[PDB]
Structure formats: C-alpha cells, structure tokens
C-alpha cells in the first residue's frame, strides 16, 4: 500500500479530539446514507469551508469510503490506500479545500 | 500590576479558537447574571471537569470578573492583576481544576 503521513499527528488538541470523538462533537456530516461526527473547530483548522457546526449533507460524487479517509487524515492519522483510491481522495481534498491532503496525494502519484 | 504568563499562547488550535470566539462556541457558562461563550474542546484540554457542552451555571462564590480572567488564561492570554485579585483567582482555579493557573497564582504570591 501507499502511505500518506498527516502533518497533524502532534497538535496536542487535535490528538485529544481524535481520542474523544464522537464525544463533544458539534458537527454531523452526512454522506449518502452514512453519518460522520466531527468537531467544527478541528475542521476550521484545516479548511475554512469545512468549519461549520450542525448537520449537513455532502453530495459531490464523494463516497463514504473516501470521506472516512479524508477525516482520519484531518485528525492526525496517516492514511494507507490501494492504487485506485488516490485520485478520488485528491479530488475530494480539492473540492473541500484541504490543501495539505491534495498535495500529499499528487506527490504519491 | 502582577502578570501571569499563559502556557497556551502557542497551541495553533487554541490561537485560532481565541480569534474566533464566540463563533463555533458550543458551551455557555453563566455567572450570576453574566454570560461567557466557550469551546468545550478547548476547556477539556485544560480541565476534565470543564470539558462539557451546552449551558450551565457556576455558583461557588466565583465573581464574573474572576471567571473572565481564568477564561482568558485558558485561551492563551497573559493575565494582569491588582494585589487583592490573586487569591480569588487561585481559589477559582483550584475549584475548577485548572492546575496550571493555580500554580502560577501561588508562585506570584
């Protein structure tokens, strides 16, 4: 597999938030049928577009499998991917403004 | 005046939260008549006791003036105090479990 290192694994509050979730989560992002709790503050720290509270639906041909990988990256976990998973992740990171992930994907390609 | 340096002034997410507030705040702490918005996640990072979402009232003979100083410290601002303000701040930090502030107060005394 391909491994993408996350530059967020050593922010002390991001670490704490990763251990807590779903506790204290104020955001619920909905992807087709699947539900993802998150901390609006953590999201704001990586992308102004994503820093919003409450429930909302993501609709742009982004799969739950791809969104789960983007969300782990944001919470400081390295991501490990199969070959055909890189391009959909890059496209999701572009559309949602997560610049650090977009560039990691384009590097591994 | 006496100055207490805060050890939180360089956590990148705490800095961002300090610039945002009251935006994205999920907690409202009520002190007599006065209202203080906060991020439950930031509070959890300094004291397990304070890491809770929603509205709640603080009642323990803690003044709004003293609570405002404790909250600024938690968000990374140094605090500047008059002589008779140190002991009430120390007592508030003891009761709410903010250990870093309790010890800074006892040092300046």
Burial (CB count within 10 angstroms: exposed 0-12, middle 13-18, buried 19+), residue B47: middle
Nearest-angstrom CA–CA distance, A33 and B49: 35
The DSSP call for residue B64 is H
Q: How far is CA B102 from CA A17, B38, B95, in A?
A: 25, 20, 9
Alpha helices in chain A (DSSP H): 12-20, 40-44, 64-74, 86-95, 99-108
Put simply, whether B44 touches A (Cβ < 8 Å) is yes
Put simply, whether A39 touches B (Cβ < 8 Å) is yes
* Long-range Cβ pairs for the range B28-33 (8 Å, 24+): B28/B54, B28/B55, B28/B56, B29/B55, B29/B56, B29/B57, B29/B58, B29/B67, B30/B55, B30/B56, B30/B57, B30/B58, B31/B57, B31/B58, B31/B62, B31/B63, B31/B64, B31/B67, B32/B64, B33/B64
The DSSP call for residue B60 is S
Experimental method: X-ray
Distance from CA of A5 to the nearest CA of B (A): 19
Are A81 and A109 contacting, i.e. CB atoms less than 8 angstroms apart? Answer: no
Resolution, given in Å to one decimal, reads 2.0
Domains and CATH numbers, chain B: 1-109 (3.30.710.10)
Pair of tokens at residue A4: 């993408």
Q: How far is CA A20 from CA A4, A65, A87, B16, B27, in A?
A: 23, 21, 30, 20, 17
Greatest Cα pair distance, chain B, in angstroms, is: 36
Distance from CA of B20 to the nearest CA of A (A): 9
B31 sits in which H/E element: strand B27-31
Put simply, whether A37 touches B (Cβ < 8 Å) is no
């Amino acid at each position: 597999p391909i491994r993408l290192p996350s530059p967020y694994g050593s922010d002390r509050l991001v670490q704490l938030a990763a251990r807590l979730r779903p506790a204290l989560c104020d955001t619920l992002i909905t992807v087709g049928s699947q539900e993802f709790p998150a901390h609006s503050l953590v999201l704001a720290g990586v992308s102004q577009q994503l820093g919003r509270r409450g429930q909302w639906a993501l609709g742009e041909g982004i799969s739950p499998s791809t969104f789960a990988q983007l969300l782990n990256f944001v919470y400081g976990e390295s991501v490990e991917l199969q070959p055909g998973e890189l391009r959909p992740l890059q496209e999701a990171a572009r559309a949602l403004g997560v610049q650090s992930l977009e560039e990691a994907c384009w590097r591994a390609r």
